[PDB]
Design an enzyme around this catalytic site. Structure first.
Site, PDB file in Angstrom:
ATOM      1  N   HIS A  94      34.581  -8.912 -68.439  1.00 31.93           N
ATOM      2  CA  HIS A  94      33.732  -9.813 -68.899  1.00 31.93           C
ATOM      3  C   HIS A  94      32.374  -9.578 -67.763  1.00 31.93           C
ATOM      4  O   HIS A  94      32.577  -9.410 -66.743  1.00 31.93           O
ATOM      5  CB  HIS A  94      34.371 -11.097 -68.787  1.00 31.93           C
ATOM      6  N   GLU A 104      34.913 -14.882 -64.961  1.00 32.91           N
ATOM      7  CA  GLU A 104      35.659 -16.073 -65.767  1.00 32.91           C
ATOM      8  C   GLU A 104      36.202 -16.973 -64.473  1.00 32.91           C
ATOM      9  O   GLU A 104      35.878 -18.119 -64.605  1.00 32.91           O
ATOM     10  CB  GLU A 104      36.721 -15.451 -66.704  1.00 32.91           C
ATOM     11  N   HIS A 117      39.599  -7.108 -66.017  1.00 35.81           N
ATOM     12  CA  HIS A 117      41.085  -7.678 -66.154  1.00 35.81           C
ATOM     13  C   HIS A 117      42.001  -6.416 -66.587  1.00 35.81           C
ATOM     14  O   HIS A 117      41.737  -5.768 -67.317  1.00 35.81           O
ATOM     15  CB  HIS A 117      41.204  -8.577 -67.431  1.00 35.81           C
ATOM     16  N   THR A 197      40.658 -15.487 -74.067  1.00 38.49           N
ATOM     17  CA  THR A 197      39.994 -15.301 -75.365  1.00 38.49           C
ATOM     18  C   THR A 197      41.245 -15.952 -76.237  1.00 38.49           C
ATOM     19  O   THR A 197      42.340 -15.962 -76.148  1.00 38.49           O
ATOM     20  CB  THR A 197      39.748 -13.954 -75.819  1.00 38.49           C
TER      21      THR A 197
HETATM   22  C1  LIG Z   1      46.876 -10.108 -75.571  1.00 40.82           C
HETATM   23  N1  LIG Z   1      45.958  -9.435 -74.993  1.00 40.82           N
HETATM   24  C2  LIG Z   1      45.265  -8.738 -75.981  1.00 40.82           C
HETATM   25  C3  LIG Z   1      45.165  -9.788 -73.982  1.00 40.82           C
HETATM   26  C4  LIG Z   1      46.070 -10.642 -73.014  1.00 40.82           C
HETATM   27  C5  LIG Z   1      44.983 -11.334 -72.042  1.00 40.82           C
HETATM   28  C6  LIG Z   1      43.702 -10.874 -71.985  1.00 40.82           C
HETATM   29  S1  LIG Z   1      42.714 -11.566 -70.611  1.00 40.82           S
HETATM   30  O1  LIG Z   1      42.815 -10.682 -69.504  1.00 40.82           O
HETATM   31  O2  LIG Z   1      43.054 -13.015 -70.270  1.00 40.82           O
HETATM   32  N2  LIG Z   1      41.220 -11.541 -70.925  1.00 40.82           N
HETATM   33  N3  LIG Z   1      41.045 -12.119 -72.077  1.00 40.82           N
HETATM   34  O3  LIG Z   1      41.920 -12.917 -72.686  1.00 40.82           O
HETATM   35  O4  LIG Z   1      39.928 -11.984 -72.588  1.00 40.82           O
HETATM   36  C7  LIG Z   1      43.102 -10.000 -72.842  1.00 40.82           C
HETATM   37  C8  LIG Z   1      43.798  -9.613 -73.750  1.00 40.82           C
HETATM   38 ZN   LIG Z   2      39.772 -10.351 -70.130  1.00 46.30          ZN
END
Ligand SMILES: CN(C)c1ccc(S(=O)(=O)N[N+](=O)[O-])cc1
Ligand SMILES: [Zn+2]
Ligand SMILES: CN(C)c1ccc(S(=O)(=O)N[N+](=O)[O-])cc1
Length: 258
Positions: A94, A104, A117, A197
């Site tokens: 991000h 974030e 991440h 997200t």
């Molecule tokens: C289930 N998957 C697709 C997933 C899980 C967690 C994340 S995160 O690191 O919290 N960042 N985000 O949500 O943008 C991203 C993707």
């Molecule tokens: Zn993320």
């Protein structure tokens, strides 16, 4: 009219389609460094990335994901707050439109230029889609980026971005070693939270490293040339793809370090 990071579809709107946006364990959060308590019963993290197998890089219209082979315990996170084994599936970032925003998580309200991440799933649930339905299904290792010296281990990611400019483009991305994205120290903060997200599922143990990595202004500028849009559509730069800090509610942030 899908979710995104514009005025009309950004974080303040997500609750309409995803009411858990106002839930009890949402992410990200501000890390108040004087309120986080050292927890001497945590362990050291174990980050075992030597056998990682990257496969592909994808612009999904929200970020870009570097995807790994997760059909065996090739790259795993263990220890720290975690029980059991969490397999690396992808990483993404991000970032902001300027260097003073993009992360974030925040640290004493400080925003970093970007946040990495590394997403891992708990192998006791068998597959990623089952894991996201569990309160201990995922572990996300979060790493702050600040602008200064280049990060050599990031440059292979930077240079493939030209090939995945727009939403839905992918490129082969084999033999990338995520160890080159780590800082020197594995000191961390941890708390229970969520995806940042949609669908905002409350399935994540967050492990946020204290030490940022340094990337160059030229490296982050290349992130900001990506597009949210698809090919042949009006250009919308992929910038400011971060969710702001959410209420901490009934949670404690624990520190691995004194
Ligand atoms: C289930 N998957 C697709 C997933 C899980 C967690 C994340 S995160 O690191 O919290 N960042 N985000 O949500 O943008 C991203 C993707
Ligand atoms: Zn993320
Ligand atoms: C053969 N050529 C023209 C070529 C090869 C690789 C690259 S890259 O920078 O590794 N990737 N990319 O651009 O997306 C660029 C150009």
């Amino acid at each position: 009219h899908h979710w995104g990071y514009g005025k009309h579809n950004g974080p303040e709107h997500w609750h309409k389609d995803f009411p858990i946006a106002k839930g009890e364990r949402q992410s990200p959060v501000d890390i108040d460094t004087h309120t986080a308590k050292y927890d001497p019963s945590l362990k050291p993290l174990s980050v075992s990335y030597d056998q990682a197998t990257s496969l592909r890089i994808l612009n999904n219209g929200h970020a870009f994901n570097v995807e790994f082979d997760d059909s065996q315990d090739k790259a795993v996170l263990k220890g720290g707050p975690l029980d059991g084994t969490y397999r690396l599936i992808q990483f993404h970032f991000h970032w902001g439109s300027l260097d003073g925003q993009g992360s974030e998580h925040t640290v004493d309200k400080k925003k970093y230029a970007a946040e990495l991440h590394l997403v891992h799933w708990n192998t006791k649930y068998g597959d990623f889609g089952k894991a996201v339905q569990q309160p201990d299904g995922l572990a996300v290792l979060g790493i702050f980026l600040k602008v200064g010296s280049a990060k050599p281990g990031l440059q292979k990611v930077v240079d493939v971005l030209d090939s995945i400019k727009t939403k839905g483009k992918s490129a082969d991305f084999t033999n990338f070693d995520p160890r080159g994205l780590l800082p020197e120290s594995l000191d961390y903060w941890t708390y229970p939270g969520s995806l940042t997200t949609p669908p905002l599922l409350e399935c994540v143990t967050w492990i946020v490293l204290k030490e940022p990595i340094s990337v160059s202004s030229e490296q982050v500028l290349k992130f900001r040339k990506l597009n949210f849009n698809g090919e042949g559509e009006p250009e919308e730069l992929m910038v400011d793809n971060w969710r702001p800090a959410q209420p901490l509610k009934n949670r404690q942030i624990k520190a691995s370090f004194k």
